[PDB]
Each structure stands twice: as structure tokens, then as C-alpha cells.
Amino acid sequence: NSGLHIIIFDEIDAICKQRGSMAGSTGVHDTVVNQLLSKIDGVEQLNNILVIGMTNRPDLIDEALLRPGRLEVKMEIGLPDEKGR
Amino acid sequence: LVKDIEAMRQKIEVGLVVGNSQVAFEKAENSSLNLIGKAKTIINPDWNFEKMGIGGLDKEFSDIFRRAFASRVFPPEIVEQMGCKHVKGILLYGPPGCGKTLLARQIGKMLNAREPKVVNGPEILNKYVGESEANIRKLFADAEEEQRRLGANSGLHIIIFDEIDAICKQRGSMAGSTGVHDTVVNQLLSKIDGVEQLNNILVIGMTNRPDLIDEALLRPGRLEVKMEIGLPDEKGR
Amino acid sequence: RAFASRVFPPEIVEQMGCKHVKGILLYGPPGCGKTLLARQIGKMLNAREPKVVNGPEILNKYVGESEANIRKLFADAEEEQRRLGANSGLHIIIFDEIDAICKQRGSMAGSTGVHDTVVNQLLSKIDGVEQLNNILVIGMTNRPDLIDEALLRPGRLEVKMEIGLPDEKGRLQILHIHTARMRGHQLLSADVDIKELAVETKNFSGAELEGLVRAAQSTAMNRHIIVDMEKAESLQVTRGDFLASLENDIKPAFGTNQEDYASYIMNGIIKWGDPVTRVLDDGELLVQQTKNSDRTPLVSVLLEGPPHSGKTALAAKIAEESNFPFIKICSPDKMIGFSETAKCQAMKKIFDDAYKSQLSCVVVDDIERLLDYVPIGPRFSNLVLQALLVLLKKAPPQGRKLLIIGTTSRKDVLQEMEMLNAFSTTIHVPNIATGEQLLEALELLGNFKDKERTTIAQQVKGKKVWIGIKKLLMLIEMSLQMDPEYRVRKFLALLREEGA
Amino acid sequence: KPAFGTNQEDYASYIMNGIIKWGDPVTRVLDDGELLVQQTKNSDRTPLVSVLLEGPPHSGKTALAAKIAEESNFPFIKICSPDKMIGFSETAKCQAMKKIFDDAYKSQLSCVVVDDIERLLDYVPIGPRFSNLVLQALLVLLKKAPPQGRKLLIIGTTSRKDVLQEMEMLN
Amino acid sequence: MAEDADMRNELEEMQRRADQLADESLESTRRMLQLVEESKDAGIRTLVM
């Protein structure tokens, strides 16, 4: 029954890009993302948080992280029609 | 508390201990009585798993179970007749979202009586030399002495690594010529097959990039089983 | 070498002046059995209690504690030197994964710390100004070559001994030593043949050898073991019998993998005539070149034929038929996308480690693919060519014998690259020329019965055939998939167009 | 939700109008495609098959190649297309296609589309130029077998096959 | 760039007297715990008698 702690990463893409021995030698300092995806989906259930993430360059991000349960939902927001505008 | 009486053979209710009456002792439940000898006659680490949270892998679970938990669950006497040392060192390699850390979770925490020490990726690494590495032996140093001063019989100790490929990679190709991650791995290898030949642990790693992982670590006895898990068939699905 | 000095009666060396050896070093590939050896040494051999150090266990953050933990090791053994000069109880040290603590002093890359140069304290302690005698020290490493050689020169450490992989029969001792207890309590059948295993284990070593054993006991129990209870039965009667074979097949990788010819061999070899015999005979006459003669330690062959002839498959057949200790297939499959340098590098590793053996054979498949070759205009990579053409004429050291094959579907490109001049010889693969020869072949296969065989056979012999197998398979197959009557007519009509 | 495996949506991209039947040609062709998937599904001793579709330009090649897979109902299909590869140096290009095939080699069987090959591998007539590396990797893969028990087909397209005879990938 | 340097460095321990000499003051504080109570012991019983 605990309360949420939301965490906010302003820019994901710089922190974590694909770790697949790409973009030069092993990404940039990819140890980080390993720690992260072990943390959020780790051996502990950790049912009590959602992390928000935001990019303007999404495709880079590793599918390992994007799959359902670590982050299920990737949404696109696009230039609105007249009504929204 | 008398348990069973046998005559010189019928089992009787009330009898008379005489000179040539042999007697056996057994520590009670939730007992810390260390009885030795074989004037005795039990520990089974697995009391319940009916089924836990899994489908589709009834082959793979069977293989892992028989290989690394059957030596545990056996008559000890016959296995020391057999003279084989327990396999340790599970590995799991696969794509994401195929239920590996779940699997690892359930056995350590739901199957057998211990609390496992778990690293979430590296927690290890530190700004100061030697203490990050030392945390490894800070891991092993609660189970090593335990074997030393209880011998063979012991409560199981467990280590779950996760996303181990980050911390360990092939030596000589590491962040330049010498490498940062080189000395942690040379400790890990030094302990697992180490000169102490501790028998009382299993190391559970998991990866999505197993080719990176060094064969030096994967040869049998350090991590024996490299087990693929993959996209399930419909019936498992 | 190093224990004569311990065992002898003292007077004899007292007439000599030799200072007794400090230490040794032993290395090799992993899982090869070295740490066992280093336990038993010091377990059995000396009267002393050893102190082990694990590799980084020395290191500590405060600037002087690293070295100040090393001198701790040797203070006892030096004080007893001081106290008793001539003799002592031989305090011995065991390092482990020593390569980290000692590597070349003049590399700080990735460390960016001076504490790599603890080594100076180390070897300045060992011989130092103060000689320490009646101590022994042993190193252990995967990586022998990164060590500062200031401590590999003799007298600091004499011996560089490299523990290699087991010999086939020595592997038997490694095997029998484990199975002694298993048999001694008669949990081992008399049916299993350790030799039958040991020949069927090409490169299994040490732990790799022991792994199937440990697994075998698991698989053997599990039957008698068996839900909620997951009972272990009381039944104590069992033994692993010809399940070591099954798991040897499935469960471990060799650790040096050749096992799979399957990707190369789908169907084996259909023995389809005289040419196949001529070829294989030429082959088992060629393999003997190495083994008999010591003036041609290197020999070199080409396999020339048209495409889709399975040349590269029977090359592997002849390799396994040579039954050498070390065989490998340099595939473009394993090397893909590699720029020419790495594409050379893989090959580099292959021949350099292959030379290690007293012999080996190697095949090079589809060189036209390996070295990328296309007309439209000649274009290829030369560097691989140059390297390769040197490697052909590199003679291994001291009569460690080599055999090489290469394969092409085209020689007419090659005679301009001057490769086959460098090759010793070439052998031709004629491809199937006629209906009788063919019909015999496919009836060895099957998958046309006699009516169909004949139904074909009327009109084949009147015609002349130029074909190879690898096309024929797909033809018979895809034609087969059609409905029964239609099958052979379609086969025929395909042959009309393909071979014309 | 999209998935690691096939989508319902990759297709509507490539076939926007579907495939209208104008004649027997369409029948024969895609029936041969059906024939081939049944060959692979049923058979052994042909773990892989290899086909390409020649047509003249602006005769829909890729549509057919998609509909074949869509009718095969094999579980794993990832088309490899140039549109998702733009500007790539030949190195990362071949990494991409190999990545596709290695994911595919996981499943028990699969259908892979190469399309617009002559644009996948750089090609121009004038002083004729192309990438050698992508060529070689491609066609060894066409000649490659996955681990045993697995089965696949590789469909390809081009608007010209004459230069491909010249480049000795056709066999 | 393409530069990854991740590094470590070592510590300088401030001279915290760096001798056992601390004990003597600690011995005085032992004795003031120790030798004081019996004053009260004999005090209360001196007051009883």
C-alpha cells in the first residue's frame, strides 16, 4: 500500500543508447544502462514506481529496455490539428 | 523422546534396554544440535515448490533441476560413495522478456531456505581501488568460513549476478590495453574455482550477450551450464 | 628441476654453491588442470601450511598498504632466515591470477595510477638485496605474455612451463582417476568403455572432461528420484550406462569447437561412382605426405570443380578421415562483415594456434568468397591474398606437419592470381555426366521408386548430362512436392532447361 | 501492441492497395510461392531455399514477396529493406542484415525478404560501382544453413537480373 | 574524441597522532571511572555506622 515515487529523466537518449557494441566501443559507458535495467526489473518486485522518459530521438534506445514491463508504452505526440491548436 | 523401538525383529511399545541394545539419535526439527557420527538415523533444502509462476520450460527446468539440485537432494552417503562434487554455476543466456530473472528469483527466494545475496548489475564498482573488488570477497566471506568450520554439511549460500556482461568482458580488449574491469574478474575466477574448493555455493548469472562472456569463466566448474532460453512455442505460450 | 634441492641429502649441494630456486610459474588455457596441481603441491609435497593470496586481494586504497601487505607475507620467512640461516620450514606462497598484479610497468592505460608499480617492491623483495632462500613461490595465469619479464628471468622465476591440453590416453588417466570411486562402490557397470569415450573426445580437457561425469551422475540419479513433494526415492541401485555418450553429444561444448560438420554435411557422401573413389583415394594418399615425410612438413592442395558440387563437404570428410589431432574450417560464415584486417586476423589466429600442434590440417572454403571476388571489372581484396599466399609458403617450426586445402568453383580466375603455382597440387572434381551414373546415385538416395526410375530411365541415356549434386537435391525435392504423377514430369522438364 | 516478431502493420506499408488479380500470371506465381513454403515446411534435406523475383521496373515485385509470406503464416518474418537503411556505410549495413538473420536463426523457421537489392547493395551502371562487402556477406548467407532443425526461405527482388548473372550470385 | 577514461585515485590519511600515546590520557579516564566509586561506597557505609 506504499505511495509512488515518480522519477523524471529529462533526456533518456543521451544517457542510454544501444549497448550492442555499437556507436563506437560499447556505446558510451554502457555499464550505466545495465545497472538500470537490472534495477527496475530486478529480482525485487518493486511494484511502487513509474519512471517517465522523454526523447526527441527515440529509435536509438535499446529494445532491451523498451520491452513490456520495464517500459511498455512508447507514445508519440505530434503536431496537433486545428482543434488542439 | 523415543521414536522407534525394535526387538531382537519386532517393533514393540514398551521394552527393556539391555547391554546389547543399540540406540540411534536424531536432532529434532528446528534444532541447532550438531550430531556427528553414524549412530544417527534430515535436511532437504526444498520443502515446497508445487509449481511456481512458469510455463513452457518444462524441459529446461527439468534439466537445470536434475543437474544442479539433484546432487543436493539425494542420500549423502551414496554420493560420497560416488565421490562427486556438486555442480555450481548456472548461466542463463537469452533475449529479453523471456522470464529469466523471474526464474532466478523464484528458486533462490521461494524454493530453498536461505536469503540470497543479489547484486543489481554492478553495485560493486567504486571510486577507490580495491574496495569494490573487496566487496566480492565480502560476498563470499559469509559462506566460506561456514564450510570451513561445518565441513561438507551446510546451509546453502547463493550468489545471483545479473547483467554480468557489463562488469566482465574478454581481457586485453577492455577499455584500452590493460583495462578497468580486469582485476575484478581475476578475483572472481580466483574464488569460484579457488584454492579453497568450497562446495557450498551456486552462482547464478544472466545476460543478453553471452558471447562476450569469457570462456575462461564458462568452462565447467566455474559456470558449468550455459542454458539458452528462447521464444516459446504456442503450447508453452 | 625444483624439488631435487629439497629432497637430496644436504652435504652434496653444500659442496656446490647453488642458491636454491625461488619459484616457478605455470600457465595454459583455462580448465586445463593447473590449479589442481598447485593445490597438491603444498598440500602433499612440503611440510608447511601454505598461505594463499588471491590476485587482487593485496590491493588496498591507502598508498602504502598494498606493498605493506606484501612484506607481511615474507616477514616470517625472512625472520627465520635471519634466525636460522641454513634451513627453514619452507614457507611457501600461492598467487592466483597473477597477471593483474604483475604486468609491464610502463603501461598505465586504464589504470591511471602508480600502484601498478607495486611490482618493483615485489621483485625487489624476492631476490632484493636480501637473498631469501628456503622459500618457494608459484604463479598461475591464463595470460603468460603480459608479465614484466624482470621477474621471469631465471632465479626470480626459472620456469615458464605451459600446461597444454591432455593427450588422448592421458585423458584416460584423468578419466579413470575420477571413476575409481564410482566403480569401487560398484555403482558402475562393466559395459561402459572409457576408451570408447576417450577416442570420441577430441579436445575435452580436465574440467571439460569432468563435466560430463558430474552431469552423468545427475542424469543417472534423476531416473530413480521420481509435483509438491518431489520425492527422492530410497532406491540406491543405479549406474550411469551409456548416458555419458548421450550427454557428451548434447550438453557440453568442447571448448574448442569443431564438432559440427552438419552445416557442411547435410547428406554425407553419396558414393556415386568411380570419381568419388579416385578422389578419396588420392586424398588418403595425400594425407600420408605429411605423416611419412619430414622434408615436406607443409603440403598444399586445391579442389577444383564446378559450382554446386559439394567440394567443400568432402574436404571435411577427408579431414575427419585423416583423423588428425587438430582440424579446422576457416569459413566465411564465421567471419562476416570483417574488414580485411580482421578477416586476416582470424586466419592469423588459426594458423598460429594450429602450428602449436605437431600436426593439423586446415581447409579454406570458397576462397572466391573469402577473398571477395566479382567481375564486373576485377575487384577483390589483396591483403588477404597476400597474407594467404605467404601462409602457404610458411613452413612450420621443426617439422610440425601441415596440410592445407582450398576450394573454388573457378580456377580460371586463379591462374592469374598465381595462387595455385604456390599450391603443391590440385585435384579435379568431375560432375555427373550421364543417366546411368545418375540413376544409380538417386537410387542410393531413394525417393524415386522403380517405376519412376524406369519412367525416367527410358529417355535419359539418349541424352548427355552435365550436372552437380547440390542443384539436383533441390530439384528432386521441389519436384517431389507436387502431386504423385506430376512429380517426375516436372523433374524432367526442369532438367531440360537447367543443363541447357 | 507491436512485438519482437511479425506485425500486422509492416505489410500495409508495402502493400497499400493489396494485390488485385489481373490474370493467370498472378495465380501461377503466388501458387509457386505456396508450393515453396510447403516444400520448406514439409521437407528436410533442404533446410533453406532461395528465390528471387525478377521483374521489370514498376511491376510490383515487393508486394508479391510480402503476400507470399503473409500467406505462409510462418511465425517469424522480418523484411530487410533499404528504406530502414539510409546513408549507411557498408559496415553498419551488413551488420544490420546479419542482425536480422541471427535473430531469425533463433526461431524454428522463418521468411526473410530482401527487396530492392540493387539499391541495398549500391549499384550504378556508370563506371560501374557497388559495395563489395555487402555482396559477399549477402550471398554466403544465401548459401548458409542455420543450426539444424531450423528452416527458412530467402526471397529477393530486383528489376534487373542480367548484371546478377554477371556478378555470379544467381547460381 | 571517442574518449572513455574512467579512473581512480588513492587516499592521504591525515596524521592522526600516529602512535599509541593516546592511551595515557585514556588511562587517566580509566582511573577516573575506576578509582571514584569506592569513595561513595565507603561514604554511604561510613554514614551508616
Ligand SMILES: Nc1ncnc2c1ncn2[C@@H]1O[C@H](COP(=O)(O)OP(=O)(O)OP(=O)(O)O)[C@@H](O)[C@H]1O
Ligand atoms: N514463463 C515465462 N516466460 C517468460 N516470461 C515470463 C514468464 N512468466 C512470467 N513472465 C514475465 O516475463 C517478465 C520478464 O522476465 P524477467 O523478469 O526474467 O526479466 P527479463 O525480461 O527476462 O530480463 P531480460 O530482459 O534481461 O531478459 C517478467 O516480469 C514476468 O512478468
Ligand SMILES: Nc1ncnc2c1ncn2[C@@H]1O[C@H](COP(=O)(O)OP(=O)(O)OP(=O)(O)O)[C@@H](O)[C@H]1O
Ligand atoms: N588434470 C586434471 N586432473 C584431474 N582433474 C582435473 C584436471 N584438470 C581439471 N580437472 C577438473 O577441473 C578442476 C581443476 O580446474 P583447473 O585446474 O582446470 O582450473 P585452471 O586450469 O586453473 O583454470 P584457469 O587456468 O582458467 O584458472 C579439478 O578439480 C577437476 O574437477
Ligand SMILES: Nc1ncnc2c1ncn2[C@@H]1O[C@H](COP(=O)(O)OP(=O)(O)OP(=O)(O)O)[C@@H](O)[C@H]1O
Ligand atoms: N561425392 C560427393 N561429393 C560432393 N558432394 C556430395 C557427394 N555426395 C553427396 N554430396 C552432397 O553435396 C552436398 C553439399 O553441396 P555444397 O553446397 O557444399 O556444394 P558446393 O560445391 O559447396 O556449392 P558451391 O560450389 O556453391 O559452394 C552435401 O549435402 C552432400 O551430401
Ligand SMILES: Nc1ncnc2c1ncn2[C@@H]1O[C@H](COP(=O)(O)OP(=O)(O)OP(=O)(O)O)[C@@H](O)[C@H]1O
Ligand atoms: N497484384 C499486384 N501485383 C503487383 N503489384 C501490385 C498488385 N496490386 C497492387 N500492386 C501495386 O504495386 C505496387 C508495388 O510497388 P513495389 O513495392 O513493387 O515498388 P517496386 O515496383 O519494387 O519499385 P521498383 O519498380 O523501383 O522496383 C504496390 O504499391 C501495389 O499497390
